[PDB]
Write a protein that binds this ligand. Structure first.
Ligand code: 9SL
Length: 825
């Protein structure tokens, strides 16, 4: 296997060439491909001439556009603020679950708040080993009959690991730095070198604070404790021999890391525009670069075309002003060098390129027109900037090879992150670890919506869409056509977009491409984790139309289904707590009332043991035919050769709500179904023979507390009620979407004033297009002061299906859409 790294300069090619020699990764061979600039490497990766390079966040954005179609795959992790430990968060969530779901696992945390490596389930006596994330090591379950397993100690903290590694087996790495750790195992804020006498500050994860390095014999530095803000900061660095302030920059000479860099271009320019130091607001006044050419007298801005913006660079011949180290003033350290050599009056870079030493001739130019010392960048800066990232082709044909190589090179301690030949070659010299990004991340989710739009805003006038119009997202062609019919009558309040599926609609809404979509329950966990909110919900209750006629009035019964455990009045010995091994009937695999809710509760109370093994003989269409979940099934439509048992079809006699009812009455101890199935097929409501004369009073429903009740009390004796379907949108668009939909509904709902013009809740083009056809009306979501998960799902459903946890991953989009960002206010 090979990885071809694209380099942008001779220095970097030489360093990459050194790694080809010095770094030995079995099975994966590195190679180095030279191009003359960041942009020529981007094109090489797009063409397959190379596979990977490291890019500044600004170029990550540029590379994500159709010209190059690259995506970020690997980056250094960062932190915004101190967080609860996972174990303590987990305890809090599980303890907040529905107390009526008894016997749930509550994690055991240690005196540092981490997971004990041995975890146990009180009500079942099972124990198992966990990793530091609290995830079970599969295959370590031991039963109460046995003693608790022996589990490897948890991995050490970075500091204690780095301490042990620095000791490297010996009694002391004599003459070498050994980190000093606190009791929680984080880095002490002040670190000192035990041989040179130098001291400096680090943040809680051990990154050095620039401007704090102090030689022995000087007053100790002042170090902040509990510093978990590890985002990088754009800064303007000046010499203390000058005296102008930030607002007096017009006409000065400047050094920038580069035209396409966030710290060298986007962050300063954004501030120039907000302060009105640049006469410029939109693409009507020209290009940003041209306006910047009028602002400064002479600069070095690698990659610029305007002449005075290259005037201060010092690259030889065609190398002058290239986005490449062949230009000595390129990049963070190049712009600092340009200040240091007095080609500029100010350099624009980020805190990680500031001098380490406290004492010296440099300080920061704050945008509030004061100056502050190097180590105050957190209060003297031009904004946090995004992380930088390794990129490859969107297709991801080499992603695994690139990740594997960098993981092994780092394990082996290869010299990735420094070099004799120069600074920031291949990777930033400040980098300490590169980790894989979420598999579905793209530039939008990596940079985050604020920096993504801010960088877009410099390249084109972004016309923000009207708050008086809802762009509805459709998932198939008939929906799109119903939506074009709505738009035609809507007077412009409705417009349409198209996507392949509900999750891509969620993505469009996150990215500002659509405004609203109706979601099945099964997509709501993903949509709420990504940060959308219910705006209105589908009210399905055919009996009481009062909530629709007089909106706002309190709702007696929302009308959603209730999942119940149905058994015969005869079978008196079956309770909830003894269903194990019995014979059960399920509408079909994947049904929420017939399967998801039952499977969730069983997993919750039996250590995630397969619902397949929990029951003896059961019928659940959609399972394997040789499995015990199909043995009770029959099929026999026309009693044909291919009776299609467990068929997910009406060819299976036991499929669906009625079908699960048959399976119970004929050969079953329990059926999992909506609370309506029994009534719908007893009291002779079903003319068929098996249901004829069945009567409702002959059955009852199991309650979670072991008791029972008659089928009529499904509201107080159910496995869980389902929440209604919801129309979701962005938080800041909820009020608009509510306002527009409730107006549309006054015209085109079931009692709409113009319901002859258009009907929201039906169509000739197909069934349940945009909304479910049985919707009575849409009702504004009355947001409560609680976790939205519990607010939207209801506590019972939340804990039964998701263990009342924010950590389930039913869609691979969740890690990408919850990725945290380095954004400003
Ligand atoms: N009557 C009624 O059932 O209203 C439903 C409405 N929307 C939900 N999905 N919910 C589930 C839980 C809940 O409290 O019923 C609720 N949460 C809020 N905020 N209002 C309710």
């Amino acid at each position: 296997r090979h990885v071809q790294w694209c380099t942008i300069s001779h220095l970097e090619q030489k360093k990459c060439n050194d790694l080809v020699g010095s770094c030995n990764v079995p099975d994966i061979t590195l190679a180095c491909v030279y191009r003359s600039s960041t942009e020529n490497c981007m094109a090489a990766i797009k063409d397959g001439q190379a596979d990977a390079m490291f890019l500044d966040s600004g170029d990550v954005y540029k590379a994500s556009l159709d010209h190059y179609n690259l995506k970020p795959i690997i980056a250094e992790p960062y932190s915004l603020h101190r967080e609860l430990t996972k174990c303590l968060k987990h305890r809090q969530e599980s303890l907040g679950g529905d107390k009526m779901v008894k016997g749930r696992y509550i994690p055991q945390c240690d005196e540092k708040g981490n997971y004990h490596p041995v975890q146990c389930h009180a009500s079942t006596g099972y124990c198992w080993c966990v990793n530091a994330n609290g995830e079970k090591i599969e295959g370590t379950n031991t039963t109460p009959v046995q003693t608790p397993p022996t589990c490897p100690s948890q991995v050490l903290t970075k500091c204690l690991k780095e301490r042990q590694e620095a000791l490297g087996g010996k009694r002391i790495a004599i003459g070498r730095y050994i980190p000093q750790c606190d009791e929680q195992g984080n880095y002490r804020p002040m670190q000192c070198h035990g041989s040179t006498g130098y001291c400096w500050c680090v943040n809680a994860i051990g990154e050095k604070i620039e401007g704090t390095n102090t030689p022995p014999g000087n007053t100790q530095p002042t170090c902040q404790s509990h510093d978990w803000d590890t985002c990088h900061y754009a800064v303007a660095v000046v010499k203390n021999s000058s005296t102008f302030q930030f607002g007096q920059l017009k006409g000065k000479r400047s050094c920038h890391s580069g035209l396409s860099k966030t710290d060298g271009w986007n962050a300063p320019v954004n501030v120039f525009v907000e302060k009105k130091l640049l006469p410029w607001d939109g693409l009507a006044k020209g290009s940003i670069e041209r306006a910047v050419s009028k602002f400064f007298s002479a600069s070095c801005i690698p990659g610029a075309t305007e002449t005075n913006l290259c005037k201060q660079c010092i690259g030889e011949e065609e190398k002058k002003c290239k986005s490449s180290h062949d230009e000595p003033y390129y990049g963070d350290h190049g712009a600092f060098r340009c200040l240091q050599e007095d080609k500029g009056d100010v350099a624009f870079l980020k805190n990680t390129a500031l001098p380490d030493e406290h004492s010296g001739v440099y300080e920061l130019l704050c945008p509030d027109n004061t100056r502050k010392p190097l180590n105050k960048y957190k209060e003297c800066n031009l904004g946090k900037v995004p992380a930088d990232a390794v990129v490859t082709r969107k297709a991801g044909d080499k992603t695994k090879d690139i990740n594997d190589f960098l993981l092994e090179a780092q394990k082996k301690k290869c010299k990735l992150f420094g070099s004799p030949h120069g600074k920031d070659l291949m990777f930033d010299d400040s980098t300490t670890h590169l980790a894989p990004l979420p598999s579905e991340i793209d530039a939008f989710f990596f940079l985050g919506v604020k920096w993504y739009n801010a960088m877009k805003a410099l390249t084109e006038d972004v016309k923000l869409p009207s708050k008086n119009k809802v762009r509805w997202c459709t998932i198939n062609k008939p929906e799109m056509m119903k939506c074009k019919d709505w738009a035609a009558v809507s007077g412009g309040a409705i417009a349409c977009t198209e996507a392949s599926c509900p999750e891509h609609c969620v993505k469009q809404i996150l990215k500002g491409e659509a405004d609203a979509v109706t979601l099945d329950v099964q997509y709501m966990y993903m949509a709420l984790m990504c940060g959308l909110l219910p705006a209105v919900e589908e009210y399905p209750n055919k009996d009481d139309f009062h909530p629709c006629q007089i909106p706002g009035s309190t709702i007696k019964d929302f009308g959603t289904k209730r999942a119940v455990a149905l058994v015969k009045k005869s079978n008196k010995d079956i309770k909830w707590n003894n269903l194990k091994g019995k014979k059960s009937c399920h509408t079909h695999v994947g049904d929420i009332p017939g399967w998801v809710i039952p499977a969730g509760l069983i997993s919750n109370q039996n250590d995630n043991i397969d619902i397949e093994s929990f029951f003896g003989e059961s019928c659940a269409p959609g399972s394997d035919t040789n499995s015990k979940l199909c043995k009770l099934c029959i099929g026999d439509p026309e009693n044909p050769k291919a009776s299609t048992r467990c068929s997910l079809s009406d060819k299976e006699a036991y499929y669906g709500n009625e079908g699960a009812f048959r399976c119970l009455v004929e050969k079953g101890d329990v059926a999992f179904v909506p609370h309506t199935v029994v009534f719908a097929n007893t009291d002779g409501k079903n003319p068929a023979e098996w249901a004829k004369d069945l009567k409702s009073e002959d059955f009852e429903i199991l309650c979670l507390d072991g008791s029972r009740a008659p089928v009529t009390n499904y509201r107080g004796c159910n496995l869980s009620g389902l929440p209604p379907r919801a129309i979701v949108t962005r938080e800041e668009s909820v009020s608009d979407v509510v306002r527009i939909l409730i107006n549309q509904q006054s015209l085109y709902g079931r009692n709409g004033f113009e319901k002859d013009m258009f009907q929201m809740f039906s169509s000739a083009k197909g069934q349940n297009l945009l909304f479910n056809d049985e919707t009575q009306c849409l009702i504004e979501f009355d947001r409560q002061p609680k976790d939205i998960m519990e607010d939207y799902f209801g506590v019972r459903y939340y804990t039964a299906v998701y263990s009342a946890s924010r950590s389930a991953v039913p869609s691979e989009l969740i890690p990408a859409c919850t990725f945290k960002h380095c954004s400003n206010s």
